[PDB]
UniProtKB/Swiss-Prot annotation, chain D:
It comes from Plasmodium falciparum (isolate 3D7). One of its GO terms (cellular component) is cytosolic small ribosomal subunit. It is found in: Cytoplasm. It comes from the Eukaryota. Its main location: cytoplasm. This is Small ribosomal subunit protein eS1. Transmembrane segments: none annotated. Belongs to the eukaryotic ribosomal protein eS1 family. Disulfide bonds: none annotated. One of its GO terms (molecular function) is structural constituent of ribosome. Keywords: Cytoplasm, Ribonucleoprotein, Ribosomal protein. Component of the ribosome, a large ribonucleoprotein complex responsible for the synthesis of proteins in the cell. The small ribosomal subunit (SSU) binds messenger RNAs (mRNAs) and translates the encoded message by selecting cognate aminoacyl-transfer RNA (tRNA) molecules. The large subunit (LSU) contains the ribosomal catalytic site termed the peptidyl transferase center (PTC), which catalyzes the formation of peptide bonds, thereby polymerizing the amino acids delivered by tRNAs into a polypeptide chain. Component of the small ribosomal subunit. Mature ribosomes consist of a small (40S) and a large (60S) subunit. The 40S subunit contains about 32 different proteins and 1 molecule of RNA (18S). The 60S subunit contains about 42 different proteins and 3 molecules of RNA (28S, 5.8S and 5S). The gene is RPS3A. One of its GO terms (biological process) is translation.
Curated annotation (Swiss-Prot), chain E:
This is Large ribosomal subunit protein eL43. It is found in: Cytoplasm. Pfam families: Ribosomal_L37ae. The lineage of its organism: Eukaryota, Sar, Alveolata, Apicomplexa, Aconoidasida. Coiled coil: none annotated. Component of the large ribosomal subunit. Mature ribosomes consist of a small (40S) and a large (60S) subunit. The 40S subunit contains about 32 different proteins and 1 molecule of RNA (18S). The 60S subunit contains about 42 different proteins and 3 molecules of RNA (28S, 5.8S and 5S). GO terms for cellular component: cytosolic ribosome; ribonucleoprotein complex. HAMAP family: Ribosomal_eL43 (MF_00327). GO terms for biological process: translation. A zinc finger (C4-type) spans 38-59.
RNA sequence: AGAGGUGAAAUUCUUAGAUUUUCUGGAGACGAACAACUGCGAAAGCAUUUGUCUAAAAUACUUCCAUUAAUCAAGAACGAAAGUUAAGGGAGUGAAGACGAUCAGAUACCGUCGUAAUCUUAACCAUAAACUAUGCCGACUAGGUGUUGGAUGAAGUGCUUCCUUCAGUACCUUAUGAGAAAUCAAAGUCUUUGGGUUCU
RNA sequence: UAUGUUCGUUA
């Protein structure tokens, strides 16, 4: 765990079966179209996979089609300029700052805001080390509120 | 050199425990460290029970009890003999 | 016929107030305490002082006509000490031997839900 | 003293004895009317002494002087509270005690603050030491108990509310409603106090004394 | 560049009057000369005109406020209690 | 999470559909009837707000009172200026219709 | 002896060979005879295909399901 | 007609009614009992109800990304109490001080009073035996009794208990493990000496 | 749970 304590080994473990499940008679000629429709209707890939798993019974998009969901979402040009986790961290930091500008006495909120901003900077450095973010991306704390886009 | 494993108190997973005040001397003592005796006593001794229960009415009147719940600092508890010094090995026995 | 008073007994490691009033608490009939019984500037909390305080409060109640008593016990206060003082024992003892009838007994010592700071420092009394 | 004289005390018709004792006054000489010296007198009277039963000995009712006629005083309900010994008996280590309070106005336009207490039950096959409840369960229990307080107090007059205090219908109902969430042992109205009462009406006082 | 290390706007007073007096007057002239948020137009353009009067440069609308800040905590809490009811 | 839902809906509307903000554009749009829904910021001057709702009820279009002021609405729409008035010419893939 | 261990199923997740405890199942409501796929440890509400009826409430685990229905493992 | 208070007293209050009893109104502080070798938090710390705002952690996951990580000079946020500044508050306690005692003396311990302080807001200060005197991350090594929070499976009466498991949190026994020993399940896996890292 | 101080230096 990056900050605080607690190992928290809670996670999801993929099955040994790396292939598409035998019982799935459905065809991958339209799974990508389904996720494309979901993304257009407006859904982040993290929860696109979840609604695909629950409401469509097609787990492991990587097994149904040989490609991962964010990859094919990019291949259709859908993917947003700011990735999942960076955007979620930005949103959380924005909410914290909005709370703080009203409650100046929330020292605990200030500490958590510093922690989440540190996480934002670490993740941003990684994502712009990859070409997944323009080299001038900075996360100005003044402009982050509208930066969500 | 670390007389007791628990340091003479019962604090774990905690940083600060609010103090109470000794019932005898009034000294501030952390609540987790104080010697606490819940004292449930008769109002009066057995002879005065016998006399009141005949001088009363209702012919079945039951004398109310007294719930005191004292808490003492280590010095006051030792002086009042609520706790003994105890030998090194018996020091680990708690019940 | 059985006429009732309320005897507020106050025992506080010093003199023992025996204070008999009517039912409402107002309109006090007789208060004796323990100071007027012993003239030693001390022993005011003694069971002997409380017994002598009670065995004349009984005579005055007998004269006043009151024949039964509701005992109402009090131990100093919310910040000083919760246990009734030494004289409480002999107070009800002598009230019982006095011959007047006794009803309900209750401990009405003021117990603070708060924790107003008690006297002495955080190091307590050193004597 | 010689110049004093006795007065008798009466209780409302919903009790049993209706004559719970005696009070005394000083001289009536002006300007001391020796009746304003009675009005607004509060008497702590045990339910056992009001109803000749040992079972309810742990409750005391406050009866307030409200009218003097000739030599007997009439009084009225002015609050109740359990006795300190019983309250301290109900409290044991290893259980969580849930306290609730509410302010409720009756149809008679009487404003009351009522405080109830409750504790958790061990039940049979637990084979543990503690019956602690989660804070969420405590909060739900307190909400339910406060809702019951206001519900079975705002739909009635004062007289029937006092009348149902005697058989503790509030406590049984709170047990029944909270059994579903966490089993509770003895829950009772710890204390009821009068916040505000309507203007005195000797008529309405009589239509409960008679 | 940075023209004063700490004296800020009180540099107008030079060395005169005590340092504590200058610091205390700084702490409130900072908020006296500030621009506040006009709740009527949403533009942060309301400045103090006279001791208790605050005018928005956009709406031209003026409100009664504190001596040195648009609102005072006492009146802010006072209004809040009324709004609660 | 009471106004966050419509903030998300509005963000998706900016992403997909086409819209217009400003008093003049809103009046023009729902005078020609092209308006679908109109957000009014809580800060909107009373005369302008009333003319807008009168216009919208004449043209049979919905009006939603935004929780925030013209700064909050401006940010919620992703812009760096105040809005105080918004018309959606067509809903994109947004459930803001219901 | 850790290779031919056989009661690793009762073991905690990520045992000698990590393997999810969840699965997938089909549901047949009696009097409805509907065909649709369901995920054990489902996370959101789910509806039927033939006649819309609530099927399982999403909890921290295997859901509460319904008082009836014939639910069958999809394993091969 | 005494009351406070003490080892015993006295200072102190007290026929102008003290203390004591009952009621009403105000005030500030505190939040007992429940309350625990319990919970939360980075630490300092956090305990009356309700609402709103905010965050975290554990668990469950066939959800997403795919090395984004560990520890870190500089630097930064927070940091008990006391103390400082400015308004407010000011009951109780009470560094100073003033008495009364005790003593050879007593400037102390004890008692009566009592200023600052203690509380609120806005700023400083940056220190505590700020202690489990034990840096952080990772792996391995053992039994049992508990307990806190999830999850799985099973059963007396829709309810209630047991099993398994994860994450906390303690405790007891054991060491042909360690240690100078006290002791330690980490302070072990160290002359059979090297997983990474910072500070001293 | 009143008061009760001190013991020159070296070997």
């Amino acid at each position: 765990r990056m900050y605080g304590k607690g190992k928290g080994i809670s996670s999801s473990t993929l099955p040994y079966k790396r292939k598409q499940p035998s019982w799935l008679k459905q065809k991958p000629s339209e799974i990508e179209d389904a996720i494309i429709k979901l993304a257009k209707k407006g859904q982040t890939p993290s929860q696109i996979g979840a609604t695909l798993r629950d409401n469509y019974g097609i787990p492991q998009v990587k097994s149904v089609t040989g490609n991962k969901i964010l990859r094919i979402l990019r291949a259709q040009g859908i993917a947003t300029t700011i990735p999942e986790d960076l955007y979620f961290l930005i949103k959380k930091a924005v909410s914290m700052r909005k709370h703080l500008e009203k409650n100046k006495k929330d020292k605990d909120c200030k500490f958590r805001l510093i922690l989440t901003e540190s996480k934002i900077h670490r993740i941003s450095r990684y994502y712009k080390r990859k070409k997944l973010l323009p080299s001038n991306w900075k996360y100005q704390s003044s402009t982050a509120s509208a930066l969500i886009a | 050199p670390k007389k007791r494993r628990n340091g003479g108190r019962s604090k774990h997973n905690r940083g600060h425990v609010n103090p109470l005040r000794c019932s005898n001397c009034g000294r501030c003592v952390p609540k987790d460290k104080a010697i606490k005796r819940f004292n449930i006593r008769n109002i009066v001794d057995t002879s005065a029970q016998r006399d009141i229960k005949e001088a009363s009415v209702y012919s079945t009147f039951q004398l109310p009890k007294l719930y005191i719940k004292q808490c003492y600092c280590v010095s006051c508890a030792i002086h009042s003999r609520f706790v003994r010094v105890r030998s090194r090995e018996q020091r680990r026995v708690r019940k | 016929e059985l006429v009732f008073g309320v005897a507020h007994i106050f025992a506080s490691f010093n003199d023992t107030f025996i204070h008999v009033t009517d039912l409402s608490g107002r309109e006090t009939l007789v208060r004796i305490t323990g100071g007027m019984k012993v003239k030693a500037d001390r022993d005011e909390s003694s069971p002997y002082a409380a017994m002598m305080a009670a065995q004349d409060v009984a005579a005055r109640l007998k004269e006043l006509g009151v024949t039964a008593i509701h005992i109402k016990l009090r131990a100093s206060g919310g910040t000083k000490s919760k246990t009734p003082g030494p004289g409480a024992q002999s107070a009800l003892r002598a009230l019982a031997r006095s011959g007047l009838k006794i009803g309900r007994i209750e401990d009405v010592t003021p117990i603070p839900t708060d924790s107003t700071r008690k006297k002495s420092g955080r190091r307590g009394r050193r004597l | 003293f010689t110049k004093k004289e006795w007065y008798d005390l009466k209780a409302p018709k919903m009790f049993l004895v209706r004559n719970f004792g005696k009070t005394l006054v000083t001289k009536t000489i002006g300007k001391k009317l020796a009746t304003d010296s009675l009005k607004g007198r509060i008497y702590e009277v045990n339910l056992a002494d009001l109803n000749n039963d040992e079972d309810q000995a742990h409750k005391k009712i406050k009866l307030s002087c409200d009218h003097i006629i000739n030599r007997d005083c009439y009084t009225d309900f002015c609050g109740l509270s359990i006795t300190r010994d019983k309250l301290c008996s109900l409290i044991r280590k290893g259980y969580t005690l849930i306290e609730g309070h509410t302010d409720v106005k009756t149809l008679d336009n009487y404003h009351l603050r009522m405080f109830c207490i409750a504790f958790t039950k061990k039940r049979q096959n637990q084979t543990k030491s503690t019956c602690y409840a989660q804070t969420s369960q405590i909060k739900k229990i307190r909400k339910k108990m406060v809702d019951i307080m206001t519900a079975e107090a705002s739909k009635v007059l004062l007289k029937d509310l006092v009348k149902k205090f005697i058989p503790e219908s509030i406590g049984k109902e709170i047990e029944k409603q909270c059994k579903k969430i966490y089993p509770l042992q003895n829950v009772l109205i710890r204390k009821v106090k009068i916040l505000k009462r309507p203007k005195l009406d000797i008529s309405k006082l009589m239509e409960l004394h008679t | 560049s940075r023209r004063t290390k700490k004296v800020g706007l009180t540099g107008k007073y030079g060395t005169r009057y005590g340092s504590s007096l200058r610091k205390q007057i700084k702490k409130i002239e900072l908020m006296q000369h500030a621009k506040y948020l006009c709740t009527f137009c949403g533009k942060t353009a309301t400045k103090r005109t006279c001791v208790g009067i605050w005018k928005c440069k956009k709406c031209k609308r003026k409100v009664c406020g504190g001596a040195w800040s648009l609102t005072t905590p006492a009146a802010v809490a006072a209004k809040s209690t009324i709004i609660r009811l | 999470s009471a106004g966050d839902n419509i903030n998300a809906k509005l963000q998706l509307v900016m992403k997909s559909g086409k819209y217009q903000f400003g008093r003049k554009s809103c009046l023009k749009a729902l005078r020609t009837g092209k308006g679908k829904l109109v957000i009014v910021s809580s800060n909107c001057p009373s005369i302008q707000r009333s003319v807008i709702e009168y216009y919208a009820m004449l043209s049979k279009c919905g009006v939603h009172d935004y929780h925030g002021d013209n700064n909050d609405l401006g940010t919620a729409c992703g812009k760096l200026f105040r809005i105080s008035c918004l018309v959606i010419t067509d809903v994109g893939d947004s459930d803001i219709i219901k | 002896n850790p290779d031919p261990v056989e009661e690793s199923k009762k073991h905690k997740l990520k045992r000698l060979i990590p393997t999810p405890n969840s699965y997938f199942m089909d549901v047949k409501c009696p009097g409805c005879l509907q065909i649709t796929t369901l995920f054990s440890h489902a996370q959101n509400v789910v509806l039927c295909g033939s006649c819309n009826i609530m099927l399982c409430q999403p909890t921290g685990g295997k859901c509460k399901l319904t008082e009836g229905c014939s639910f069958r493992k999809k394993i091969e």
